[PDB]
């Protein structure tokens, strides 16, 4: 009966397409969450518009074009956002909790699980988590990039049944509907390639839908201004574009790796790229061609092919220095080379997420 | 003329020694701060009371004794807490920005300088930064542990002239005013020494760190009228820990905030070299290594007693160090097949004590 | 195109039938009003819940059962109420102005016209008036008594096109729903009469609702003044919009074919400044033939009052048959009571026409 | 031990001299009250600045110069004001109740006692009454006129020990201080007389309030709101601005309500009767009545004027207006024969009259 739904709210929806947060639009979406919340459902908000809110409350000032100017706006803005959410949800006697996070908080299993328990604990006590990127205290490197992908990670953390991306249009279209009249809303997508047939605004949404679906979470893109949208999505009623989740989803045991930020990279053979992508094999040091960055065993890493194309992320069995030394060698050689040995495999397939 | 002050406010100050946040108490401090802000000074708040505000708001709910329970109260509580600070400051037409951080945000130079640039940017546009530990989202390993230490780090990050630790008593006394019936208030201190660490424990660490980065730091009572304004004028108001004559190289102040990635046990001969003569650690003297860590990450250095003598940037990864531990420097390349100089931890990337 | 609607929200609507104000319920109704306000319609709120807001805010204290305990709760609770309204309307970018009144504010034409001009001026500047009884500062004598009757008087003062009474039930049935399964909601009413009051009373069981009795008095007042008035369930989705559109949502008490002269609509709002007991024949004249009261038929006079003031006309049984403007002072009515109109000047020395209360300064029933 | 105080704050004090309400200046004074409230004392607030608040909240709109404009601003503003007081007071965990009144609420003994009982009930339950003139709903004829005079009446209603009129200067000076740097402050004042009325014109309403309140036995003070700890110092009786001293033996409680009544009509009175009223404290006989103005009934409060046109007394009329004209100028034995009825010999008894 009861379900867990992550709702992502873009800046356009929160402002109604303006430079000022629109408390009428927001209160109406809050009402819908309370409606479900009271029915025994578990609601997780992922909010944007912090920087937007910062500009407004600071009266739209002139600030240099630097990382730090965005961060100061987020610091001021995130404060104003959370005040808004806590207040509007208090109309319905619902409490909220502020969680700000980045990829850095999902770099170990242990830190991912810490975030999970918190998020669960809130929901277990009828508190609606309000999630946002920690924009005020984060470098570019450790950031998720956007709240679309963040929401897919929050869905993974929350154990969501559905993920709802509310946005400035009805869903995913075949062509751009603004320029082409023959453009048509796509009702259902059965795997992200089934969608990049026809289908720049929509890029990070498809990435989010890919991640969530692979983790077994249905994901829907719809218009926030659509009346009763959040309820109807809970009931499985067609409402925008439904990205149907993967039938046999990727092992929970390694879904946390979606959220990690790579600690370094490894370039790899054609034969090794083939083995990973064609057969889901483990990476052996045989096929390693170069190793970049300084990283320890247990850290997550990127695996690139020789054209610089990112092919997988995974947990590295050896440190960066050692990889360089066993690179190109057979597994039996490892012990002779390093003086130690942690198995025949540089990255194991059970600690790898492909693509 | 214009000065930057960091003001740390602990839960006892904020609650007034009660259980609920005391908005009458807090607004009087906000007022004092606004007074300095309007005179051109640069105020930074370091707030506690997130978890306190969380239980209050939730109605003192029965929860399991677990880290998640402490983090859920903080999640709710920091929301309640930042809302208080924003509202009370708008009375005096002053804005706040919320900065939540842990040691993990000061593990690189890059990340430490990012926070610094954000903090200063706020101050440049007259916004009062309200800083706190990111309790809601943090494992124990990356937590600073306390806002006394956090405020010292905030001071370094903010290029503060003064750090003000407001507390529930007059300051740092000799023995104790309760126990020994004369035990006076220590007006001034010149370097925290072990005889001074014999006698608040966390407040001394924070003072020590602030003083070594060259920041005058004061422990005073939050309920002393006009305390904040006084401290800014340099008026004797409690206990003043004087800043170190020649402060620690700005070049390496970030290391104060990095969480150690692992630990090294070191010779009695190399313990001497590090502390006495300020020398770089050579593998020669390493006895044991702990944890997975890469080159570039900050680590702990322990004497054979198990005592923390230094924090520094490791030149070699953890596996390397175990292989070159207890060898001469020229042995390195033969042992590893690579080399990153003769030194395990350079004194230029090290902090003593 | 644009209309003026007065919405009356009783305590149970505001609380959702609890002892605590229910902001989810209220904000939902603000939303509906903001919608109308954005579309250029002029909305007036008549709010209850002031005393209830007070108990809630003060933690349900034990207080003596006195007039002053109700008034302290009303002071504390009205402060809270007007906050709530203000804050909620601000979500939709709408301003509210507070107006507290009693019948005393409507005892003159002058003070009635003052209350009117202020209400009109708020509306002309797109401010929503939030009207209540001044329960914190009032004796029982100058009070209206209930906000249903206050809302009728508001609708008059605003020049409202419709009056909407939101309540805790669908609103006025043809029979008791529990006693009769075919009992249906009464859709239309063309004038309130005795028979209807009896239906309304037999439809609620127990010590019949003095409380719906007041809603019918409000509806009579409004209807006579040419204002359609509707009783409906506050918790009905879309109700306020549907009422503005003319959609059948509860019970529609139709305005009077030819309404009572605007000229004297303010008399509804005045608190009588004394009474006059009247003949059998003068009762007939007043009620059956819309005649003026002559001193001839006055049997007894009560209280101290002046010419120009409004007073109650009682029939011999004790029933209040009319309210109207007294042409003479009370002391003068005693001296001319029982005498013909040519004797007035010989009796008093002065004169003010032949009539104790004129039919054009009188509201019957 | 535990006294009752009425702090009156004018628009100037609330706005710090500006056209916006200064919440920093106001929270400072709220705090000074809460300190006494916590100490067992009973605090009443009389607040101006409702129209000030309306103009600000409405974004300073151009409105026609009419009474409906002032009233609409007061409706909007009175809502804004009471939020403020409630919110700022809740910082100190103190509740407020809103009381809005006019002279019409003090025209009977009955309505006056009702007010008093409510104001006493609030205070008894530790609630700070925030009082203002009901500007949104009131014709000019029933308004008090200004919050200074209203605060005196609140002081009477609340049964206060001290009345504090916070304003934007040190207190009452020997002359206007903005026009004179040779004008000293006045520390103490023992009864207001016509000579002092001259020396006060805007400060004119503060003397009227002080007068009313002192005759009711309430010490009243004019001090500067900006002055630090001024509220606390006043409660201690520390000299802080100008202290108007309470009448040694104050006007009967039995008839203090007459101060707050709005005159229903007026009576022009003789030269001799003026003397009998003002010098010898007599009851007004019809003998001395010269002319009567307005319609009024018996039991209503009216104004008595001397042959110049000055207000010499306020009092409860025994006969109605149509009658008082008929019996004016005649002896008392003649009343029943003229009117046909009687109500004693006296037009206005001295036990339902307040002089001056
Ligand atoms: N961190 C951004 C979110 C924008 C997005 O990812 O869509 C903000 O709150 O402004
Ligand atoms: N299959 C090998 C590829 C290297 C090769 O083909 O030699 C690997 O897993 O690395
Ligand atoms: N970070 C803690 C305060 C820790 C301390 O008391 O120093 C909090 O927000 O409650
Ligand atoms: N005046 C009452 C409401 C009376 C009624 O609804 O009839 C109140 O505000 O509590
Ligand atoms: N029609 C008369 C009736 C008086 C009488 O019956 O004597 C009146 O209006 O008073
Ligand atoms: N009643 C006025 C104040 C008048 C005065 O200060 O005397 C107001 O609310 O603005
Ligand atoms: Cl699953
Ligand atoms: Cl819905
Ligand atoms: Cl595992
Ligand atoms: Cl605010
Ligand atoms: Cl320096
Ligand atoms: Cl100070
Ligand atoms: Cl009409
Ligand atoms: Cl609707
Ligand atoms: Cl005199
Ligand atoms: Cl007395
Ligand atoms: Cl003080
Ligand atoms: Mg790294
Ligand atoms: Mg690590
Ligand atoms: Mg029945």
What is the C-alpha separation between A312 and A348, in angstroms, rounded?
11
Q: How many residues does chain D have?
A: 356
CA dihedral of B252, B257, B263, B269, whole degrees rounded to 10? 40
- Give the list of residues 6+ apart from residue B340 with CB closer than 8 angstroms, or none: B295, B315, B316
Residue D354 zone, left/alpha/beta (φ > 0; ψ -120 to 50; rest): beta
- Strand order across the D301-305 sheet: D289-293, D266-269, D301-305, D311-316, D353-355
Q: Which ligand is nearest to the CA of A212?
A: 7
Tell me: do A187 and A310 sit in the same domain.
Answer: no
What is the C-alpha separation between D255 and D216, in angstroms, rounded?
10
What is the C-alpha separation between C76 and C74, in angstroms, rounded?
6
Instruction: Name the one residue in this structure whose structure tokens are 């946005």.
Output: A167
Which one-letter DSSP state was computed for residue D288?
G
Domain that holds residue D281: 263-356
* Phi, psi dihedral angles at D98 (to 5 degrees): -90, 125
* Closest by CA position to A148, among listed A136, A162, A132, A165: A165
A residues 116-155 lying closer than 8 A (beta carbon) to B: 117-118, 120-122, 125, 127, 129-130, 134, 136-139, 141-142
- The DSSP code sequence of C136-159 is TS--TTT---SHHHHHHHHHHHHT
Cβ contacts of C20 on chain A, cutoff 8 Å: none
Cβ contacts of B23 on chain D, cutoff 8 Å: 91-92
Contact D178, D161 (CB under 8 A): no
Tell me: do A217 and A273 sit in the same domain.
Answer: no
Contact B42, B3 (CB under 8 A): yes
Tell me: do A336 and A194 sit in the same domain.
Answer: no
**Directed axis angle between helix B147-158 and helix B109-124, to 10°?**
70
B residues 55-74 lying closer than 8 A (beta carbon) to A: 57-58, 61, 63, 66-69, 71-72
Contact C130, C45 (CB under 8 A): yes
Which one-letter DSSP state was computed for residue A173?
B
Q: Does C91 touch chain A (CB under 8 A)?
A: yes
Q: Which ligand is nearest to the CA of A305?
A: 2
Contact C176, C203 (CB under 8 A): yes
Distances (CA, A) of B268 to B194, B304, B307, B348, C150: 20, 7, 12, 21, 91
Q: Do A91 and C34 touch (CB under 8 A)?
A: no
Contact A217, A160 (CB under 8 A): yes
Q: Do A93 and C34 touch (CB under 8 A)?
A: no
Q: Do B72 and A130 touch (CB under 8 A)?
A: no
Q: Which ligand is nearest to the CA of A113?
A: 9
Tell me: do D14 and D120 sit in the same domain.
Answer: yes
Tell me: do A23 and A147 sit in the same domain.
Answer: yes
Total domains, chain C: 2
* Phi, psi dihedral angles at D242 (to 5 degrees): -120, 125
Instruction: Name the one residue in this structure whose structure tokens are 């969480």.
Output: B259
Contact B167, B220 (CB under 8 A): yes
Tell me: do B71 and B181 sit in the same domain.
Answer: yes
CB atoms within 10 A of CB C333: 23
**Directed axis angle between helix B109-124 and helix A67-90, to 10°?**
70
Joined together, the tokens standing for residue D305 give: 């004027």
Terminal C-alpha separation, chain C: 35
The strand pair at D311-316 and D301-305 is best described as antiparallel
Which of A227, A261, A295 is the last residue before a domain boundary?
A: A261
Residue B296 zone, left/alpha/beta (φ > 0; ψ -120 to 50; rest): left
Please, what sign has the CA dihedral across residues A177, A183, A185, A186? Answer: negative
CA dihedral of D229, D233, D236, D242, whole degrees rounded to 10? -160
Terminal C-alpha separation, chain A: 35
Most B CBs within 10 A among A58, A109, A114, A264, hence the mutation to make, goes to: A114
In chain D, how long is the greatest CA-to-CA distance? 69
What is the C-alpha separation between A148 and B244, in angstroms, rounded?
49
- The DSSP code sequence of C294-317 is -GGGEEEEES---TT-EEEEEETT
What is the C-alpha separation between B311 and B261, in angstroms, rounded?
10
HSE toward the beta carbon, residue B22, CA cutoff 13 A:
17
Joined together, the tokens standing for residue C62 give: 């034990």
Tell me: do A277 and A232 sit in the same domain.
Answer: no
Tell me: do B206 and B271 sit in the same domain.
Answer: no
- Which method was it determined by? X-ray
Going by the annotation, the residues of the binding site of A for substrate are: 48, 135, 147
Chains touching D by CB (3 or more pairs below 8 Å): B, C
Joined together, the tokens standing for residue C42 give: 């002029």
User: How many angstroms does the Cα of residue B36 sit away from the middle of ligand 12?
Assistant: 10
Strands (E) in chain B, as ranges, are: 4-9, 42-47, 96-101, 128-133, 162-167, 188-189, 216-221, 239-241, 263-266, 286-290, 298-302, 308-314, 345-352
Contact C311, C275 (CB under 8 A): yes
Distances (CA, A) of D49 to A33, C268, D56, D175: 41, 34, 11, 27
Tell me: do D296 and D257 sit in the same domain.
Answer: no
CA–chain centroid gap for A32, Å, is: 24
Tell me: do B218 and B308 sit in the same domain.
Answer: no
C residues 24-53 lying closer than 8 A (beta carbon) to A: 24, 27-28, 31, 34
Q: How many residues does chain B have?
A: 353
Instruction: Name the one residue in this structure whose structure tokens are 């001193």.
Output: C295
Ligand 4 and C146: CB distance under 6 A: yes
Instruction: Assign residue B135 the CATH number of its domain.
Output: 3.40.1160.10
Contact B286, B322 (CB under 8 A): no
**E strand or H helix at D206:** helix D204-215
- Give the list of residues 6+ apart from residue A56 with CB closer than 8 angstroms, or none: A19, A20, A21, A80
Residue of C nearest to D93 (CA): C58
Which of D206, D235, D262 is the last residue before a domain boundary?
A: D262
Tell me: do A252 and A296 sit in the same domain.
Answer: no
- Give the list of residues 6+ apart from residue C172 with CB closer than 8 angstroms, or none: C185, C186, C189, C200, C203, C212, C231, C250, C251
Q: Does D86 touch chain B (CB under 8 A)?
A: no
Joined together, the tokens standing for residue B11 give: 């839960």
Which of C251, C271, C291 is the last residue before a domain boundary?
A: C271
List the alpha helices (DSSP H) in chain C: 11-15, 23-38, 50-58, 67-91, 109-124, 147-158, 194-203, 213-224, 239-244, 280-288, 330-336, 344-348
Which one-letter DSSP state was computed for residue B244?
P
Q: Do C27 and A23 touch (CB under 8 A)?
A: no
* Closest by CA position to D6, among listed D119, D103, D110: D119
What is the C-alpha separation between C119 and D71, in angstroms, rounded?
9
Please, what sign has the CA dihedral across residues B235, B240, B245, B249? Answer: negative
CB atoms within 10 A of CB B150: 25
CA–chain centroid gap for C108, Å, is: 16
**Directed axis angle between helix A109-124 and helix A147-158, to 10°?**
70
Which one-letter DSSP state was computed for residue B284?
G
Instruction: Assign residue C296 the CATH number of its domain.
Output: 2.30.130.10
CB atoms within 10 A of CB C254: 13
Residue of B nearest to D27 (CA): B91
Tell me: do A334 and A209 sit in the same domain.
Answer: no
User: How many angstroms does the Cα of residue B214 sit away from the middle of ligand 11?
Assistant: 6
Q: SS3 of B23, please?
A: helix
* Closest by CA position to A116, among listed B136, B73, B100: B136
Q: Does C195 touch chain A (CB under 8 A)?
A: no
Judge whether D8 is annotated as a binding position.
yes
- Facing D95 at nearest CB: one of C76, C95, C130: C76
Return the bridge partners of D173, or none.
D185
HSE toward the beta carbon, residue A328, CA cutoff 13 A:
5
* Ligand 1 interacting residues, C-beta cut-off 6 A: A 10-11, 48-52, 132-133, 135, 146-147
Terminal C-alpha separation, chain B: 34
- Give the list of residues 6+ apart from residue A310 with CB closer than 8 angstroms, or none: A302, A303, A304
HSE toward the beta carbon, residue C238, CA cutoff 13 A:
6
Instruction: Name the one residue in this structure whose structure tokens are 């009087």.
Output: B28
Burial A167-196 (b: 16+ CB within 10 A, else e): bebbbbbeeeeeeeeeeeebeebebbeebe
Instruction: Name the one residue in this structure whose structure tokens are 């409630």.
Output: D86
Cβ contacts of D34 on chain B, cutoff 8 Å: 24
Judge whether D202 is annotated as a binding position.
yes
């Amino acid at each position: 009966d009861s379900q867990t739904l992550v709702v992502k709210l873009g800046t356009s929806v929160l402002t109604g397409g303006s430079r000022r947060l629109n408390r009428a639009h927001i209160v109406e979406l809050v009402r819908q969450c309370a409606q479900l919340h009271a029915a025994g459902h578990r609601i997780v908000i992922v909010t944007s518009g912090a920087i937007a809110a910062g500009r407004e409350h600071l009266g739209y000032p002139e600030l240099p074009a630097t990382i730090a100017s965005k961060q100061l706006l987020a610091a001021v803005g995130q404060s104003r956002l959370i005040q808004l959410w806590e207040q509007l949800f208090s109309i319905y006697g619902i409490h909220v909790g502020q969680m700000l996070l980045t990829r850095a908080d999902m770099e170990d299993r242990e830190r991912f699980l810490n975030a999970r328990d918190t998020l669960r604990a809130l929901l277990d006590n009828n508190v609606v988590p309000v999630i946002n990127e920690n924009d005020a205290v984060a470098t570019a490197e450790i950031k998720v990039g956007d709240n679309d992908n963040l929401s897919a990670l929050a869905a993974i953390l929350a154990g969501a049944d559905k993920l709802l991306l509310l946005t400035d249009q009805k869903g995913l279209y075949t062509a751009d509907p603004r320029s082409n009249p023959q453009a048509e809303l796509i009702k259902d997508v059965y795997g992200i390639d089934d969608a990049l047939r026809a289908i720049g605004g929509m890029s990070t949404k498809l990435q989010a839908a890919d991640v969530a679906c692979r983790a077994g979470i249905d994901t829907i893109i719809a218009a926030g201004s659509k009346p009763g949208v959040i309820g109807d999505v809970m009931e499985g009623i067609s409402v925008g574009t439904l990205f149907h989740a993967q039938a046999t989803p990727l092992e929970n045991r390694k879904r946390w790796i979606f959220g990690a930020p790579p600690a370094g990279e490894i370039t790899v053979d054609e034969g090794a790229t083939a083995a990973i992508l064609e057969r889901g094999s483990s990476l052996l040091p045989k096929g390693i061609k170069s190793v970049t960055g300084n990283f320890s065993r247990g850290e997550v890493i990127r695996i690139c092919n020789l054209e610089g194309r990112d092919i997988a992320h995974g947990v590295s069995r050896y440190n960066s220095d050692a990889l360089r030394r066993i690179a190109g060698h057979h597994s039996q050689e490892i012990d002779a080379i390093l003086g130690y040995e942690y198995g025949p495999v540089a990255v194991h397939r059970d600690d790898m997420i492909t693509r």
